[PDB]
């Protein structure tokens, strides 16, 4: 289970280890990293801006 707050926390902390199970979740559930569930409702900021800002 990868919800948006958890994914943002992981990507902001830079924990690359916690992303191993993301691939089976995305493949099995037919979910994509560009889906609305993975975007901030306020701005639409995606995970990559989160990671780049939190350097």
- The reply to whether 3 sits in an annotated binding site is no
Q: Do residues 39 and 46 lie in contact, with contact meaning Cβ atoms separated by under 8 Å? A: yes
Q: Do residues 46 and 38 lie in contact, with contact meaning Cβ atoms separated by under 8 Å? A: yes
Give the chain's largest Cα–Cα span.
31
Binding residues: 45, 50, 54
Binding residues for ATP: 45, 50, 54
């Amino acid at each position: 289970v990868f919800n948006r707050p958890i994914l943002f926390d992981i990507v902001s902390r830079g924990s690359t280890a916690d992303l191993d199970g993301l691939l089976p979740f995305l493949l099995t559930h037919k979910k994509r990293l560009t889906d609305e569930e993975f975007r901030e409702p306020s701005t639409g900021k995606t995970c990559l801006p989160k990671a780049l800002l939190n350097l």
